[PDB]
Amino acid sequence: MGPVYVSGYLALYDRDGGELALTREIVAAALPPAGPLPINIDHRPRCDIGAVLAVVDDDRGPFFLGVVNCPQLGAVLARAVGPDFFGDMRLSDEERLLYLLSNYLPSASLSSRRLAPGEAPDETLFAHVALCVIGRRVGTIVVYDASPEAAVAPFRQLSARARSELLARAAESPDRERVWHMSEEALTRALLSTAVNNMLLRDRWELVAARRREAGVRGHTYLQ
Amino acid sequence: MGPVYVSGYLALYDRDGGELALTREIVAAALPPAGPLPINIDHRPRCDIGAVLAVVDDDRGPFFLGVVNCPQLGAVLARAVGPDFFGDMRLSDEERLLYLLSNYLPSASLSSRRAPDETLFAHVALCVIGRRVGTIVVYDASPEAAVAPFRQLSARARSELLARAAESPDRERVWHMSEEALTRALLSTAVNNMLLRDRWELVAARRREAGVR
Numbered sequence A: 001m002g003p004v005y006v007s008g009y010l011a012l013y014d015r016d017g018g019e020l021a022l023t024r025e026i027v028a029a030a031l032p033p034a035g036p037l038p039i040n041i042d043h044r045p046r047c048d049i050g051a052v053l054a055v056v057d058d059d060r061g062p063f064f065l066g067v068v069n070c071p072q073l074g075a076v077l078a079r080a081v082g083p084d085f086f087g088d089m090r091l092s093d094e095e096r097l098l099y100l101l102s103n104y105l106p107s108a109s110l111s112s113r114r115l116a117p118g119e120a121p122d123e124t125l126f127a128h129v130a131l132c133v134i135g136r137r138v139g140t141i142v143v144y145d146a147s148p149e150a151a152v153a154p155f156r157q158l159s160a161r162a163r164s165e166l167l168a169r170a171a172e173s174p175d176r177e178r179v180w181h182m183s184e185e186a187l188t189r190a191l192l193s194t195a196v197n198n199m200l201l202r203d204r205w206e207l208v209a210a211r212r213r214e215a216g217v218r219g220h221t222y223l224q
Numbered sequence B: 001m002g003p004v005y006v007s008g009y010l011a012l013y014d015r016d017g018g019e020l021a022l023t024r025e026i027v028a029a030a031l032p033p034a035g036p037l038p039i040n041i042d043h044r045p046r047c048d049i050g051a052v053l054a055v056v057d058d059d060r061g062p063f064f065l066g067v068v069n070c071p072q073l074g075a076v077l078a079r080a081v082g083p084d085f086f087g088d089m090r091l092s093d094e095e096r097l098l099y100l101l102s103n104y105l106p107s108a109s110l111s112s113r114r115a116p117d118e119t120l121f122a123h124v125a126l127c128v129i130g131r132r133v134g135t136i137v138v139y140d141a142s143p144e145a146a147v148a149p150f151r152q153l154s155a156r157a158r159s160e161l162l163a164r165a166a167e168s169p170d171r172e173r174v175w176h177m178s179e180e181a182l183t184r185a186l187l188s189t190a191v192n193n194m195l196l197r198d199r200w201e202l203v204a205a206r207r208r209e210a211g212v213r
């Protein structure tokens, strides 16, 4: 086991309706987070598997870089797949993990505190980032990779400024070398929860492709 | 935890290709299965949650009725659903299990061994998509309700099915399983199906094939 990195937009300005929309003003008030934001699975409490290392206010929206480093995750995922799942392919442990995570949890969801009537946004606003199948906000696909620079590279419209600032802030996060241990039983439950809550979702792979387009990540072709 | 009943066609005559196709003669020789047919999740060993109570040779294909009686199954599925999934509904624990099973494991898959006789059929695995045409299942609180939605199931076959199932020795059994093992089996179902495209279209087609409305 070693750590893996995850990144993407947490929202895109002007791209959501109503209650979901995150405005430039809210994001400016919310950053930097008052404490580090954890990364959990499907908003479940007690199943943190990483932490956001940096959030940047890019021109198109707030963009994050996270680390996921739960030793048991690879084990639980590998035990779940049938014996001939990867066929003839030879892959490292790290690459199987990346493949399964990428496809089991291809999106992110930023969760915020519910503010009271007339309570102003501040740095306590953002609570956590949940990995999920489809986020409710436009363009909230994630990329996972074995290093931070590779995790962020696919986002073609991320500005260079914001990219540099992001990578710099992340390189000095307290959470950068942390490890999140969980029992296998707890992790298994957390992953099953994602499946059960998303079982009814229609057209999930077209929705994933749409999120990818919205984010500016080169679309996955399936024509060969 | 009263038991769960499950039913459906194990195959339809004249509808599968080659390796999957079951003929009438072969089916007639295979019934009645000469020992009880376990019900499991995805053909997994050490993962029995039920048994087939009867199979009948309906005009359209072999049709089964089973009982699933595994206390831990209800608990594992119910823990998994997020706190808003049922809206402002209040479901009983049994109605919730029925719903979640219905949608988590909507199909069945009959496995055999390799002259043909009553030992041929081995077990029935619950799954997301069965390889054979029309292998949807219905789950419900009684055998009557479990078989009701199959419009094309013959009255004769339905009556023979319900009567044999009412006499089955397995009808009151219980299958205690560890929550840990169950949670693994269910997670395996999700990971092995995660990449499946248009799953609910394939299920709707299975349903139409079985003659469910």
Ligand SMILES: *P(=O)(OC(C)C)OC(C)C
Binding pocket: A020, A108, A109, A110, A111, A112, A130, A132, A133, A134, A135, A136, A137
């Ligand atoms: P998120 O996108 O939710 C935030 C709007 C709180 O995740 C969904 C899939 C529940």
Ligand SMILES: *P(=O)(OC(C)C)OC(C)C
Binding pocket: B020, B108, B109, B110, B111, B112, B127, B129, B130, B131, B132
């Ligand atoms: P079943 O339909 O397979 C029988 C033909 C053994 O299960 C599939 C999903 C493998």
Ligand SMILES: [Cl-]
Binding pocket: B154, B155, B156, B157
């Ligand atoms: Cl009849």
Ligand SMILES: [Cl-]
Binding pocket: A202, A203, A204, A205, A206, B196, B197, B198, B199
């Ligand atoms: Cl799909």
Ligand SMILES: [Cl-]
Binding pocket: A201, A202, A203, A204, B197, B198, B199, B200, B201
């Ligand atoms: Cl679908």
Ligand SMILES: [Mg+2]
Binding pocket: B140
């Ligand atoms: Mg009913």
